[model samples]
Target chain A: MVSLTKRCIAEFIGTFILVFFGAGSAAVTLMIASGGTSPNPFNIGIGLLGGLGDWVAIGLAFGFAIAASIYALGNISGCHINPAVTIGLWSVKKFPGREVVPYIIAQLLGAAFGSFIFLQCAGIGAATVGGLGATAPFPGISYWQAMLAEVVGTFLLMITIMGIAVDERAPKGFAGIIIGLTVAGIITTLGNISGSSLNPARTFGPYLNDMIFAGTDLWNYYSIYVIGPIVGAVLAALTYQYLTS
Target chain B: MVSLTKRCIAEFIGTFILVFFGAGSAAVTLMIASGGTSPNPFNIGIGLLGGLGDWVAIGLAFGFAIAASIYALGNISGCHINPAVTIGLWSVKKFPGREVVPYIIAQLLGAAFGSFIFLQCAGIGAATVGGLGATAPFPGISYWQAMLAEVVGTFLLMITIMGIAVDERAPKGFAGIIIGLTVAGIITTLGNISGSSLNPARTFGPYLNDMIFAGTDLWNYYSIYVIGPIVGAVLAALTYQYLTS
Candidate 1:
């Protein structure tokens, strides 16, 4: 068996990469679209500001980040870079229960580290202006509606993970890409409605970072991010278990 | 060996699905964002119109379409749903030369069938208004630049396919997702400048449909779509061969 320290290290690096690329892309896109001069000197020629293309670029950034992380780290830690995934697998007994807390901690720390780097690169003002890529309900979308959206989004994601990654009948060695595209699909379809936070860690990391740096009081809406994904994860786990059993 | 008939049928069906979902989503999203009433009665609450999120949805539609097609048909025919891909593989001597013409014929027919269905669903006016989801250079971007973009984009796609699907050293059963995500990533990053037609089939299907239904002459710029991808594919195949050999 692999040591817990090694697994946690893997989780840390994977989650860090995910947040850095995913949220970092979102913030940078927003800044560019706003015509604010990029703090970073490198202009990657990511043209077309503030349109449908930008959103696609952001979604792809997140999706590719997840795929890259999994490809790089899957053999080591199964790459549960998202806490909801780790907890969901645990709920289904696919992962060890004793390791859940440690994995979540590692994921959260990694996310925070990622967000911290983003704040530095994008500057506190630009990062805060974009909410540091935090997930939030759109105008006229109620908190309950947002919560339900997250639940459904995370449910679809978790089901895909369970089926492609965990099921015996599912094709092997394709879990990383399947799971990554599923995330991209969810964000593509639901990002506008609820910001599509299928992962609690993905939400909290930015939320915590924004609070720390921008003095934002986003914590009042924290329940939707936490409870929605957990509920979705549990339900997905149960549904998959029932169907397969 | 799989029968040639079965392989051709698989290519047809796979290409049909790809064009249907990819271009179909683009047409519908454009219609919705333009405030034209959707011909399809069901609205899945894909909020926001004419922004980054919409493009992400379109890209995801294409990416997921590719992934789904490959998963469903890879075993039967290797899912070379694009003529560019079929030609590329044949150039590399990985695919049978005898099968190349048949594969291209199947792909074009499948694309035509898909575009036809999209016209019926979105209506001629709406589909035409959306350019039938055709690929063209953005204003201020030179045709040469667009061609180069297509070349680079398809080159990246071909490299991923060669590495993940063709090479035995690569992981098994994950090629579909990786290839799909690669398509999505290229579109996400380059859709604005080039319209990102990494496949000649993807470009021609929509162009032909628009011409037939709307009297449009998108063919004036057709060389970029046809020649760019082939050149890029040849280069990628040669590079992959050199590296692996």
Candidate 2:
């Protein structure tokens, strides 16, 4: 039997990988785009942006990272790299209730570490310029809109997880692909609307780093990520179970 | 055993889905985005662009489409959904030479039909405004640059197919995920560069429809899709074979 510690380790690694690739790619895209001379709201920093980032770059990076993480760690910990996923699974009785808090803590710690590595690699401007991949609503978007968007994004994510990963009827070995792409699709669709923070830990880690190193305080938006994701995930999980059961 | 006719039908359907989702998403993004009253090169029509597309939308749609098609058709035809994929596999002796032309033709027809359906669905201004999802060089990109970009895009695609699908050592049941995400990643990265047409048939279908229905003459750039993709796929396939050998 896999020990609780071992499963936490897997969860940690998976979340670490998720942030490293997903947020890292977003930061890098901004860094590359920051090269432009114009100091527009869209432009990140001081250089001419070479590789343009559409929402897809960040979304797909996350998709790839999440997909790869599951492929590597699925057998070990079920790869609950996101707190929303963990909580949602528990609501559905697919995950152990006793392990829920440990899994969330591991995911947050892993995400924090992952965010830190990128900030250090990108140097001082990483957080300021890249927002360290911290997600917020885009232009003309309101707080309520961002909240609703996050709910929808996580709702879709949870539904996809239930159908592909939790449900035995799903084609074997395709959970990683389907879930990853669904994440990509969700982020791609809702990314600009709310930064697509379908997971609380993914946003928290970056915000934590930005506060410590970048002198930025984005904590005001923290609750949106947390409340929306948990609610969305749970609702979707319940919806899926209801649909199936 | 799947008959040749059956296999061709699968390829047709697969390619049809590819264009329908890939190009169809592109057009839809533009249609959705064109909701603005701006007159910029990027603006396809006139309306306020809602649901901002960062290349990822189109890229992920194509990725999802291809992945779904493979899952649906991999058993029936091996789902060569692209001429580049077909030719590249043939060079590596993984596919029969006798079927290459038929496969290509089927893919093109399927793609054509797919484009037509979207055009019909979207109605007028679909061509002039949306370009019917035809790919061309972005601002400041020259023909040669576009050519090189397509070559690079297809090269990466072929290499990915070789590593994940062709190699026996790859984890089973994951080819669809790897290849589909790889396509999303490539298009996300290179979509702005060359319209990321790693597949000749994909580009050809939209261009043909644009010519006949849209009254636009864009066939001059068609060679870029054909030659660059073929060269790149062959090189990557050969490179993979060499590395493995």
Candidate 3:
């Protein structure tokens, strides 16, 4: 195994990439609607499948983001780029208790930086109009309802992670695509209803940058994002552990 | 390897599942618009992410379809559910030449059956209104342009197939998910423009069923679907073969 320092670096880089492409794609949804810096219809339509009105584009962005990161860094850090996943892994004792905090710290910092870098790339409109891809409940949805969506989505993510990544009986190298597609599936199912954020780090990266750059106050449901993923991931990890045992 | 009879059975089952879920979701898109048998605002919203105007839902359906089939039957029959994939593999000599016709025949049959099964599930309106999820270029697009889309999309599919499935250097257990996501991604990109079949059998099955049941004629550019996928997939396999050799 590699040193903890090297592992943390991979974790940092991986989480950063996840946030950048994942949230970056979310920002792209609004970029066209708001008449973004790039004004061509072709670019906009191609930007997100004919004017970016759907959830699939954003889901693919996140899915590809997580999958590519996992392929690159799974061997190095287990690619638990999402804090909920790291916690889930620890709860199952699949990951070391001693290194949880360090892993999370690296992920958070990476996510925050990823959002910031995307801000630099897409310009101020990305923050102001796009909210830097911050997750929030759509109109008329209550907080508990929103959190329920998060919990369910993250549960899907964590259970898949356990199955493809952790189980010895499973085939090798399938963890990335299966887990990534799981995210894509969840997003398609619940994106509009609750702004599905299956990972706290994923939600946080955009929120932090949005607050700093856009002056948009979107932290009203930060706890929903955090607590929901933690709850769902832990429950899933426990459920899968029990099932296998 | 298993007997050809058994392998053909797997191919049939796998391709059948692909069309059932893949085009089945496409029919679900129009079900709400035409006021489906069981209808409500909630079900409609969830049917295709708020009324199914976008491409992602269908893409996920096809993506999940192709992937799940691959995972379930890859070892048994190589899960070449798509005729283009079979041809690509045979062109590269990765698959045996003698078995090509049997594989494609099973795939075409499976696709037709798959579309027929979906019709049973969804009712006649799914055929009349949804056209059994038939493939055709959207308004104003030329045949060549549409074929170009199919060619490019299948090229992407075939190239990725070559990388993850054929190359020994690729990791194990990844072909299914990677190939699945590749389908999902291409559908997101060129779905509405070119119908994004990327598989002739996928297009053919739906068209055949639609023609027989709906009293609708949709086989106009069936050649585009066939010629395009064959050309692109062969190019991709040959490209990968060259690059590797």
Best by TM-score: 2
- Candidate 3 chain A: 10-residue stretch with minimal lDDT: A38-47
Candidate 3 local lDDT, residue B176: 80
Q: Model 1, range A1-245, lDDT digits (tens) per residue?
A: 67899999999999888888888887776666565432122111122333345555676788889988888898899898988889899988899999999999999999889888878887975465667788877544568867876776677677667766777756876777777776766565456456777887888789889888878877888898889888888887776565444
Model 1: fraction of native contacts: 0.17
The DockQ figures for the candidates are 0.10, 0.07, 0.07
lDDT of model 1 at residue B186? 83
lDDT per residue for candidate 2 within B1-245, as digits (tens), equals 67787788778867876785577656645544443344555433211232223465677778866775665566667888999999999999999999999999999999998788656544444566667789887767889999999999999999999998888898777777678879988987787678898999899889989998889888889899999999999999999999989
The number of the candidate with the highest DockQ is: 1
Error of 2 at B51 (Å): 18
* Residue ranges of candidate 1 with Cα displaced over 4 Å: A35-50, B1-59, B65-245
**What docking grade does candidate 2 earn?**
incorrect
Cα lDDT tens digits, model 2, A74-176, are 9999998999999999998898899999999999999999999878887767787788888876655567767876775676578667756777755688888
Per-residue lDDT over B1-245 for candidate 1, one digit per residue giving the tens place of the 0 to 100 score? 56787788767766766775576656544543443333343322122333445555677768876875676557667889988888889988999999999999888888887777556534564355567678888768788998999899989989899999988798867777788878878876777677788888887788888888878888878899889888888889989999988
Clash numbers, per candidate: 5, 12, 0
Residue lDDT tens for model 3, A28-137 = 67776564332222122222333222566777788888899999999888889888999999999999999999999889889999999999999998888777888887
